[PDB]
């Protein structure tokens, strides 16, 4: 349950560390974004001597949420934080490593995250 | 009218009648019945059809010529018939009929299947390296004209190439690209 002005942890080695959601894509009054959704962010803080800059505007994909996610088999999953991964203009990710677990929802959206994540759910 | 003051020479082996405001022509190709308005009168004499009107008003001046032509179209309909040739143009366009069923492949994803009445017989002479030809015959000008333009409406000819469904040798609006 992420909306405009929410702050997320950046969960890849792209250089960015904290991001602010500017927009939830895909609808006129689409209020919330869940795992596997695409958002537009501004980078709020970075590691010293990184590639991307503080204040850049980027697309990202959500990989973890605090609000529990429902599965068709009657199970739920929630995480301790909200996290995303930055994407480039061509739809691919801008980093190499993913830090922390990712949800199984991305098995239907982006196989690059799932292949190089320490654990799925 | 000039048109409506003309006799129609009733050909060999067709019979004409008049009963209850209805003019009926019978011949080899069938029978056609056409209502005629009580203020335009016809009399069958000597095997000829003559029309006349009393008042020279415009509501009869229009009807006089109209009813001469409707009968003149009926008499030639039941004796000789009426010819129309459709020619599909553009590669990948095929026509073929089985019985009265018509099959048309005009470029869409689907196919087209049309059943015609016994008034309009169907035939299709489609040679190789040559365009398919659709031939329709009937005794009714109005109905055969109705069917002919429904088939052409599926694919109207375009200007940029002569592609589409056209009457045989029909003058086509062309336009370079």
């Amino acid at each position: 349950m992420i909306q405009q002005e929410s702050r997320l942890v950046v969960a890849d080695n792209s250089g960015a560390k904290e991001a602010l959601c500017i927009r939830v894509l895909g609808g006129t009054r689409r209020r919330y974004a869940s795992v596997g959704d695409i958002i537009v962010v501004s980078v709020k803080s970075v590691i010293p001597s990184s590639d991307i800059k503080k204040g850049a505007v980027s697309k990202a994909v959500i990989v973890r949420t605090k609000k529990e996610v429902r599965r068709p088999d009657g199970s739920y999953i929630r995480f301790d934080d909200n996290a995303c991964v930055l994407l480039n203009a061509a739809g691919d990710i801008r980093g190499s490593r993913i830090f922390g677990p990712v949800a199984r929802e991305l098995r239907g959206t982006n196989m690059k995250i799932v292949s190089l994540a320490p654990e799925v759910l | 009218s000039r048109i409506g003051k003309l006799p129609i020479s009733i050909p060999a082996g067709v019979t004409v009648s008049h009963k209850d405001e209805i003019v009926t022509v019978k011949g080899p190709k069938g029978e056609l019945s056409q209502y005629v308005d009580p203020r335009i009168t016809v009399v069958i004499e000597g095997g000829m059809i003559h029309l006349e009107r009393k008042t020279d008003d415009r509501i009869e001046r229009s009807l006089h010529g109209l009813y001469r032509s409707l009968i003149n179209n009926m008499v030639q309909g039941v004796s000789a018939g009426f010819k129309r040739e459709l020619e599909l143009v553009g590669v990948g366009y095929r026509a073929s009929n089985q019985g009265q069923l018509l099959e048309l492949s005009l470029g869409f994803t689907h196919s087209i299947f049309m059943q015609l009445p016994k008034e309009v017989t169907v035939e299709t002479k489609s040679e190789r390296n040559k365009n398919p030809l659709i031939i329709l015959e009937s005794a009714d000008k109005q109905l055969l004209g109705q069917v002919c333009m429904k088939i052409r409406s599926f694919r109207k000819p375009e200007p940029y190439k002569g592609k589409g469904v056209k009457f045989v040798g029909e003058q086509i609006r062309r336009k370079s690209g």
Partner: protein, 35 residues
């Protein structure tokens, strides 16, 4: 592709008497039922 086909037949109408136009889109293996 090859998931439907167009079928047309003309039936006389009681309101007027002249032939109307009946149209549908049925799967390719169903036109023999319609005609």
């Amino acid at each position: 592709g090859r998931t439907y086909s167009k079928v047309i037949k003309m039936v006389k109408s009681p309101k007027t008497g002249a032939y109307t136009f009946q149209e549908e889109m049925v799967p390719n293996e169903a036109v023999k039922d319609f005609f």
